[PDB]
Amino acid sequence: SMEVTVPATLNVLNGSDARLPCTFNSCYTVNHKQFSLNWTYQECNNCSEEMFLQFRMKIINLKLERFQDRVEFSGNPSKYDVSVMLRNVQPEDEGIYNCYIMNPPDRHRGHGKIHLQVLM
Amino acid sequence: ILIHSVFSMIIMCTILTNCVFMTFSNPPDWSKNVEYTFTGIYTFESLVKIIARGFCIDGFTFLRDPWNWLDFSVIMMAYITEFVNLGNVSALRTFRVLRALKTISVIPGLKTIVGALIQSVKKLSDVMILTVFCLSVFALIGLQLFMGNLRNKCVVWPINFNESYLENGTKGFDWEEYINNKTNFYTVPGMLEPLLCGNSSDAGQCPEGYQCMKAGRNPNYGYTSFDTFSWAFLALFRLMTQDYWENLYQLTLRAAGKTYMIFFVLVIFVGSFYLVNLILAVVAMAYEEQNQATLEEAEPCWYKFANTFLIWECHPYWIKLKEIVNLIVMDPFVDLAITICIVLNTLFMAMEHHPMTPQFEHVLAVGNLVFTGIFTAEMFLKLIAMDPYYYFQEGWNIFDGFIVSLSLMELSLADVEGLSVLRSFRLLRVFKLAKSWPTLNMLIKIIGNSVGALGNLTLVLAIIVFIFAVVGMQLFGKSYKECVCKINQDCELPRWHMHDFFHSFLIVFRVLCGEWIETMWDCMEVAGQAMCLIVFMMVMVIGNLVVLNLFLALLLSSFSGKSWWILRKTCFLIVEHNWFETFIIFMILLSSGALAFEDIYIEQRKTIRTILEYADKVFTYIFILEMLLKWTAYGFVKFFTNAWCWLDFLIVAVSLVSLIANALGYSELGAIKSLRTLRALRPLRALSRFEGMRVVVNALVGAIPSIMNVLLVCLIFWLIFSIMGVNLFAGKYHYCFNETSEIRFEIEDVNNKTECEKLMEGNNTEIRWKNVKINFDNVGAGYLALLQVATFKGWMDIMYAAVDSRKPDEQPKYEDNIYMYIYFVIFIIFGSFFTLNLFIGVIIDNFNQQKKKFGGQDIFMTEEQKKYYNAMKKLGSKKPQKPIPRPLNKIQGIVFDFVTQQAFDIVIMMLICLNMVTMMVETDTQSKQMENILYWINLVFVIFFTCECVLKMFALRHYYFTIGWNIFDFVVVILSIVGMFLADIIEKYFVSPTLFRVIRLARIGRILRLIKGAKGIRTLLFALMMSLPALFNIGLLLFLVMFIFSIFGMSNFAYVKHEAGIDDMFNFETFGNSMICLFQITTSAGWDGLLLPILNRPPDCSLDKEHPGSGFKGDCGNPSVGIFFFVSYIIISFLIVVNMYIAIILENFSVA
Amino acid sequence: GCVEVDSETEAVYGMTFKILCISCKRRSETNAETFTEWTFRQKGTEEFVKILRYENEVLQLEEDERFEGRVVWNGSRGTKDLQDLSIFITNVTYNHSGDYECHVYRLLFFENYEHNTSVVKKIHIEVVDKANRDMASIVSEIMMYVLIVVLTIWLVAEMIYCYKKIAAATETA
């Protein structure tokens, strides 16, 4: 894939704020309209994949039942931040976070894997 | 203490293995343990060196040796890297090149070479200072002239307010977004950068519906710019090295007009020729001094096997046969026979083509078989005639054995796939003539000295090229892959990148060749500006220094009644009259200048064409009268024994024949029409008339006889290389364009020629199977292509078509055959470097002998010029000038004291430096507040300088009009006052921004006072002034050659297709444009582009073009005369500019 | 391409004349769709009247008898980019005098930006009976002849003076 750095392992308190970033280093700093980025979450390793956030010429929150009004984006794609923030995490949120982006001026399509777990 | 030589040998093996591993681009994970082993070996050596006199404070420790510092540094950096470290992985990975740099320390003798480089650098410091200050002055000049002119682009002027959308869909109009929206520019179809335009009458022309506004980003990724001092300095440093300077020439002349070509001539003939010659001459002085300093400092078991097996004497019949065949060799008639066979073989392998009839290729095969059979027979007869042991004792015979064995291996392996480089090994047979030729033996001596007495130095050069190539590959490698689409619009790797090691070595070689800027731009656009600027400056300086030192070392090693009589004297008296000669020189000047007005703009000014045509008759009449009267004055035998008289008579006769044909009505005939273009030869009479040009041409003709043999050797060497190139590349230079998309078909749709012809029959001329038009298809085309490669112009296209070449009748594909790059590398190393060294050495010896012939005097100046030479030589000493004694006044005494301390001088120099840096800080689009600050600081500077000048005038006006530097101060300060007054009162009837810019340039003259306080720079400027007259004479000869070739361009290469290098500007359609092209070609820059559009054919042209406003038809010229025009000009220009180089270099040696 | 030359101002009665009007593109690179119209008026006559129109494939001439069967086109031949406007007159009469105006209408094509431009060039000719050779030719003839003869007299006088002086010098010895 492309150059993506993510926290290898993070622990979140019961119901506390969680912040999982997906930075990305390449040429052609991210613009607004033409740029395409995706965010998918998996409830387990071998379960089905459910996309929860997208940005096609505008930020699109799919508003899944797992992420009705909890996932929010307050990062900076220009500063290499497409992070997703999950407040009041649930034990069922234990799974995989995946950040998909694509840069129009370049031709590098890559992804990034993030592992999140919840402590009792 | 365990310092046995086997330790050095194993360290050598380990360091070469590490070098190879670094050469590997992506290290496989199974090599991590090998790298660990290498690290262990290095730390074992570190253990040895630390247990053998390790402690620093102790004397003679390894800390005293500088290279052990590098050893410890690389060990500590490896230890840091193998665990946690800083985030910049690329820099720490690059820091391992010290491992390869250790080869400098471990190999014996390299430290002396590095030291020698150090003394050369320490010697060239003064010339570096002068270069920096001269480049700064020229940078200020260019900054104040071409400020922001490089931005001038054709913006769509009829602002369409009704549909001027904003970025966010406002429907409103904002100015700053209209001037930067990239699709509001022209971008002429075919080129990449938007076309540059201009308001000036002679500048570039906007299309119908576009303006000439400055709009947006600078060309060539934004690095070609005069807007700020940094990019102006980059551009003028580029001009000094002449790297791709034709592009900057064209851009600036198209943006700011052709009238600024004076500036480029000034910078080329001052900062490009003179400064580079100065650097080279000073490095030569340093190396020669050190070289003579070195001269001052110098002041059983297998034998018994050989006697049995290597000797073939066993039976008396065989011994008798050996004696008989030894007699048969016939040594007096053996060398002649073998040389005749060798010449026949080489001129037989010369004839080679892509299209070969079966009979002709059969003849070549049979002839090569016969020749190799003769050479095998000669080898066998030599072996049987004289014992194999003593046969192989001669290195010449083992060379012949290698050649004959390689020849024999060919017939057995005649079906091997590829391996066309094997068939060219027979070319080395030509070297057998080196026994007869002493000069070919000299070439072999130079090649041997390259790897002989200077093998260590060439190894240093190889190590430098290696470490730079690996530094680039590890620093910018991943960057060239992440940022692919930033430099290449097709999102693929460019032709020249630093991803692989081979490409990195190619780019460092190119920087050594001279083309650094075109890749330095790309790597800036990819991986930052600072890193590329530092890396490329370092590699250029170091590589050029080492290559120049190697060249100089090789050059030094190679070096060591009664009415007829009365009427005759009346005619002699009238011809001898100096005023009469001035009159005839004026007449020849007018006749030569009359040819300038004959161009495409000749249907206009019909009165001018008629007047010039009718004055041609009177000019020819007066020249006929001159020829007749000179005949009468001298005599037929006296006149016809003079070459200049022959030239004059020839020109007069051909002009008279042209007039007779015109009077006979033969003007429209093809023969007389072709003879008409020979009218360009008229200015040659100036050779006979002007004394300086006559002296220079006499010197060149006198130098020719010692030069023909060297040119013959160079032709033979390039013939060997051209036969190699023809064998490698014959026929593999064919394309299949689809002109609508103008894309060369990739080899997956059409592969062979047959499939392209299937497209031909199915489609129409929209698909074309065409050649490169500069190719290896025969020895003549081989010479042309090798000339382009050795002149480093046009070599890009040839190399691209070569590395893409795969098979004689197959479509080329992108770098399937990349490794033929080494063929051009080897050609540049041997036939363009070593042959150049031989040529230069022979020229130096010839000129030394010629100077020693005429009592050590100059051979490029006339008698009056020699008197001027001697007068300035006498006047160059120290003159005890009067110290201007103190006046008889107290106030005048104190002001004289103030003006006489050195402190006053120091503060004035410092304030001039501050004014210069304030000139530096000016940039385009600078804030208006900064503009006002600069305005008032300039006003304060000018007022202060005026106050100083008037104070010194009140001090002693009459005796400060006595120094020339004071006069310079006076003129610059008063002209600055004039400039500021005109700035204040520009509101008049004569508003002229260009003259305003020039009078602001006039400010720059003040910083030239810095040379007054300098001594070495003053001496170098005095040397330039001292050698000026020879430059003047050679410049007149060069200008006259330019004039003749320009008229030839008018007559032949007008009305050619505007394809590449010939544009709406910089063409052969007008006198100004014609000498623009000729001066561009004079420095050999971009002559490939000028030559290319001639070489096309009516498939690529239209033999009947309308050409409005003229009866002339046809769209492109004759290829055969195009090649003869440009090749002959390059050779003539090359021979002339060398005399300029010799006049500068050799004069400097006599100074010191 | 850009060789713009005005037409000759004299036409001889009964012979042929080539009316010339060259308007070149500022950049030869650009491709344009051009078509023209020609307006004419006689001496002592009212406003101009159009006579011929050439639009990219053919020439249409007005039905006025002053030009029927005696005007042929010598411009660019069927290239859709005129760049060369030249009307040829056969059997020139006295009525073909006065003022001609060539109007050039261009539609330059660019990437996404058309442009319509009109250029008008005014040319005035007179019809005569004898081809009055221009003043340039006669003044050049006279100047060349007088310069030749003055050079001859100068050289002859110099030779005579030198001959006399050298004779006076050599008669002493």
Ligand SMILES: *[C@@H]1O[C@H](CO)[C@@H](O[C@@H]2O[C@H](CO)[C@@H](O[C@@H]3O[C@H](CO)[C@@H](O)[C@H](O)[C@@H]3O)[C@H](O)[C@H]2NC(C)=O)[C@H](O)[C@H]1NC(C)=O
């Ligand atoms: C530079 O100028 C050009 C020409 O004005 C700009 O291109 C034009 O951009 C506008 C809006 O940005 C496009 O209008 C759009 O048209 C579509 C239909 O295709 C419509 O659905 C939208 O609502 C909008 O009206 C217009 O088509 C387009 N024209 C061309 C030839 O590209 C360009 O955007 C400017 N550059 C920048 C960086 O703004």
Ligand SMILES: *[C@@H]1O[C@H](CO)[C@@H](O[C@@H]2O[C@H](CO)[C@@H](O[C@@H]3O[C@H](CO)[C@@H](O)[C@H](O)[C@@H]3O)[C@H](O)[C@H]2NC(C)=O)[C@H](O)[C@H]1NC(C)=O
């Ligand atoms: C695109 O961006 C531009 C500027 O970035 C926006 O222009 C702004 O448009 C608003 C809406 O009309 C303006 O506000 C009003 O302006 C009028 C002008 O007389 C004023 O009387 C009102 O009191 C009010 O302030 C605003 O001035 C104008 N400029 C700026 C700098 O905000 C434009 O609306 C944007 N378009 C879209 C579709 O986002």
Ligand SMILES: *[C@@H]1O[C@H](CO)[C@@H](O[C@@H]2O[C@H](CO)[C@@H](O[C@@H]3O[C@H](CO)[C@@H](O)[C@H](O)[C@@H]3O)[C@H](O)[C@H]2NC(C)=O)[C@H](O)[C@H]1NC(C)=O
């Ligand atoms: C080439 O010549 C022109 C005029 O002879 C130079 O000045 C340019 O003049 C036009 C008006 O004819 C200016 O356009 C206007 O600019 C203002 C600036 O704010 C803008 O608001 C208006 O909407 C309109 O576009 C144009 O700006 C002006 N050029 C500059 C650089 O200001 C022109 O500069 C000359 N080109 C050169 C010297 O490269």
Ligand SMILES: *[C@@H]1O[C@H](CO)[C@@H](O[C@@H]2O[C@H](CO)[C@@H](O[C@@H]3O[C@H](CO)[C@@H](O)[C@H](O)[C@@H]3O)[C@H](O)[C@H]2NC(C)=O)[C@H](O)[C@H]1NC(C)=O
């Ligand atoms: C050389 O490359 C050019 C690239 O433009 C090729 O021209 C293109 O050929 C295709 C053929 O399918 C054209 O498509 C056609 O377009 C018209 C108009 O839109 C449509 O009515 C047809 O049904 C068809 O789709 C395409 O327009 C044309 N491009 C241009 C700019 O004219 C050409 O075929 C290539 N030649 C060879 C020998 O490969």
Ligand SMILES: *[C@@H]1O[C@H](CO)[C@@H](O[C@@H]2O[C@H](CO)[C@@H](O[C@@H]3O[C@H](CO)[C@@H](O)[C@H](O)[C@@H]3O)[C@H](O)[C@H]2NC(C)=O)[C@H](O)[C@H]1NC(C)=O
């Ligand atoms: C360049 O020329 C060579 C020979 O002159 C071409 O080789 C021939 O290519 C054709 C089709 O590309 C082959 O025909 C096909 O062969 C396959 C087996 O490879 C077979 O299964 C098909 O039914 C069909 O017969 C032909 O066999 C082959 N010649 C030989 C001797 O194998 C080559 O294709 C040409 N390059 C092109 C057209 O780009």
Ligand SMILES: *[C@@H]1O[C@H](CO)[C@@H](O)[C@H](O)[C@H]1NC(C)=O
């Ligand atoms: C813009 O369009 C309007 C139509 O309402 C027209 O009146 C006006 O003249 C146009 N202006 C320009 C510059 O095209």
Ligand SMILES: *[C@@H]1O[C@H](CO)[C@@H](O)[C@H](O)[C@H]1NC(C)=O
């Ligand atoms: C161009 O302008 C002329 C002048 O009136 C007009 O007759 C013609 O129709 C215009 N053509 C286009 C394509 O705008």
Ligand code: NA
């Ligand atoms: Na160049």
Ligand code: NA
């Ligand atoms: Na080049």
